[PDB]
Design a protein around this ligand. Sequence first.
Ligand SMILES: CC(=O)Oc1ccc2oc(=O)sc2c1
Ligand SMILES: CC(=O)Oc1ccc2oc(=O)sc2c1
Ligand SMILES: [Co+2]
Ligand SMILES: [Co+2]
Ligand SMILES: [Co+2]
Ligand SMILES: [Co+2]
Ligand SMILES: [Co+2]
Ligand SMILES: [Co+2]
Ligand SMILES: [Co+2]
Ligand SMILES: [Co+2]
Ligand SMILES: [Co+2]
Ligand SMILES: [Zn+2]
Ligand SMILES: [Zn+2]
Length: 581
Amino acid sequence: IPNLDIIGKRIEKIKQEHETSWHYDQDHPYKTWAYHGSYETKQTGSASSMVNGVVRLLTKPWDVVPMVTQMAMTDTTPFGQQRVFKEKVDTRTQEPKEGTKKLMKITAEWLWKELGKKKTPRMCTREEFTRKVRSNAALGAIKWKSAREAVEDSRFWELVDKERNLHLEGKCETCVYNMMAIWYMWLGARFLEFEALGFLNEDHWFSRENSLSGVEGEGLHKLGYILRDVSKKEGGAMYADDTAGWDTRITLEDLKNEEMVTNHMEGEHKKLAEAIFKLTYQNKVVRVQRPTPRGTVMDIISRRDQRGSVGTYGLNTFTNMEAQLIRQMEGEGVFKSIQHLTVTEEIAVQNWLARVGRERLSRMAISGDDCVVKPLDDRFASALTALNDMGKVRKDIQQWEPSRGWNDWTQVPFCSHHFHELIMKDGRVLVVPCRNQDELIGRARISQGAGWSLRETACLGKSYAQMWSLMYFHRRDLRLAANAICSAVPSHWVPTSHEWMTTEDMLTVWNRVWIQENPWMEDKTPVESWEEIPYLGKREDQGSLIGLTSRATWAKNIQTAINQVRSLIGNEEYTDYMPSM
Ligand SMILES: CC(=O)Oc1ccc2oc(=O)sc2c1
Ligand SMILES: CC(=O)Oc1ccc2oc(=O)sc2c1
Ligand SMILES: [Co+2]
Ligand SMILES: [Co+2]
Ligand SMILES: [Co+2]
Ligand SMILES: [Co+2]
Ligand SMILES: [Co+2]
Ligand SMILES: [Co+2]
Ligand SMILES: [Co+2]
Ligand SMILES: [Co+2]
Ligand SMILES: [Co+2]
Ligand SMILES: [Zn+2]
Ligand SMILES: [Zn+2]
């Protein structure tokens, strides 16, 4: 089942740009994706990640930690792409049963209606898009060189209009994904997607206020508070099951339910969004590279159901909200059979959604595929037939083994973190985020771009340091490492583009984020120094693999390393920041 009436125009346009080498490789490796052909291509990508030499020189004890080192070994060569494709992306998900589909359709229709109560969809503009391009951007493959180049060249916008008018007659020609697993599109295709669906992000449809379950806009320093509030609900344990490869488990049915947001639109906006949904989401064309004994080729493949990562405009959050409501329903015995929803069962679901729907959403904190649920009681743990039949198979657990929850919200994993209460010297109680400090250091030692000069490398380092001092100040090693990086990088250099991304005094930012603007901090008295700001317990702070001897030596000689970095940056002026205790 590949529908060439929808994808043929895209495939033929690519075939015609490489007619000489175009061919059908009878030994292609694709099993659940439809394969259309290959052509010869120049190898792109690389098999190493680039190391941030500034962060590395100031974090020398971590040169021997395995987690840290391994993180610097990403493979975007054809070899790497094909490795991840075979293991992760080339999977099939069964179609949900009839009953499951009915639950999803009812629940999705209800959810769009709740999200739309206080919001109205709208088209986003070329001007909105262009302003966002002048900053951090969603990721498209880039004929110009940068996104900021394309937005000014008005020929770029003629191409947009060309594709847009095809979209307006239900045809698609250039919206092709590239697996260079992350999927890129031409910036023009990204614009059309933004124009149709950007309102979901820009108008904050998944903020906690509008969606009850969501946390769009919250910010790491707020998530722990949000978890602790959810824990105040009456109910069972708190559950936080990860889905194995969520993007690959998005079904065609999921995509059709997300599309019901178009029922809330009108005019050409509805037509454009319908094009994004039917032409680019439910009928995708993907380019992947593959090594062959004859050099690297590009494969053209297609598939209807999965999702490709930029975010997903809240659609992953939407679908997870829907999926977790249905698991709540199943736990509460609202329905009995995935096989067939009886007429009286469809009415119960409708009643349940009308009666307790909003309350059940607020038992949840959901960010894309990341969810925390505090259900009515622990029947939830073994309500599994809808979850599995929807394809949202739980990671690292037997299919019918019941979920394990937690009674202590400080043990619940959410958004790659745990959250802890932390007592200040004056007795006020902070809720702070926590995650393995060897991961944080490993990610800081990776320069997110290839071929970078030392200034941008130093500014990326400073960005992590300021983030550490805001978010992970309670970790002794990170506070010290942040101090060194900030001492080593000229004080007026701007961190690369969030609260840590200026040259504001970071104590000023700390006070604003954790005291002044913290809705869960009643006493608005600021702190007057970093010595006033506490650490986690020395025990629980140990979490790190580094030896105590190499940490002590690192701490004792840290100024030697700082000066070494200062010398390579240049005859500049630097500030010696308050040394961590
Ligand atoms: C937009 C929002 O507030 O939701 C999230 C989800 C995951 C996450 O991981 C971080 O580092 S911050 C963060 C925020
Ligand atoms: C706890 C500590 O002293 O670490 C930092 C980190 C970043 C920063 O940015 C400034 O201007 S001050 C400052 C201190
Ligand atoms: Co050719
Ligand atoms: Co080529
Ligand atoms: Co996974
Ligand atoms: Co169909
Ligand atoms: Co209309
Ligand atoms: Co999302
Ligand atoms: Co009740
Ligand atoms: Co950052
Ligand atoms: Co509050
Ligand atoms: Zn298109
Ligand atoms: Zn911890």
